[PDB]
Amino acid sequence: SMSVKKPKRDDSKDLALCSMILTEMETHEDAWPFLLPVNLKLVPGYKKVIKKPMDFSTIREKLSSGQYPNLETFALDVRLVFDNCETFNEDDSDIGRAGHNMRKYFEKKWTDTFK
Numbered sequence: 226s227m228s229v230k231k232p233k234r235d236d237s238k239d240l241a242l243c244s245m246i247l248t249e250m251e252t253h254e255d256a257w258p259f260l261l262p263v264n265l266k267l268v269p270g271y272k273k274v275i276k277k278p279m280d281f282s283t284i285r286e287k288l289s290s291g292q293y294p295n296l297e298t299f300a301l302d303v304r305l306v307f308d309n310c311e312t313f314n315e316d317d318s319d320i321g322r323a324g325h326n327m328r329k330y331f332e333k334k335w336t337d338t339f340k
């Protein structure tokens with residue numbers, strides 16, 4: 226509360242660490258469905274169904290231009306990519322399996338890096 230503070234966690238390296246994690250996700254062999262935005266003009270259903278599209282290139286642009294106020298807002302956009310993928314794709318599809326794999330990959334990096 227007013228004039229009563231928790232000890233300050235060192236967040237000075239957060240931007241650099243999130244960038245390293247994103248680089249590792251960009252270079253994963255299963256990253257190909259998530260590198261660029263889904264083409265809303267060529268994929269039926271996607272625009273109406275998926276209310277907040279997100280992809281790695283869009284996350285990279287936001288990270289590079291100061292659009293994440295903190296760690297957690299970054300993780301929210303990464304998870305959104307995989308939540309969108311589950312909504313639109315069957316678990317037993319190539320893109321469906323890719324999404325499950327990349328989510329597992331991310332969450333281990335997230336825990337190891339910040340927890």
Ligand SMILES: CC(=O)Nc1ccc(O)cc1
Nearest residue numbers: 258259263268310313320
């Ligand atoms: C991330 C994603 O769902 N991509 C995607 C899914 C189906 C399709 O026909 C074209 C692209």
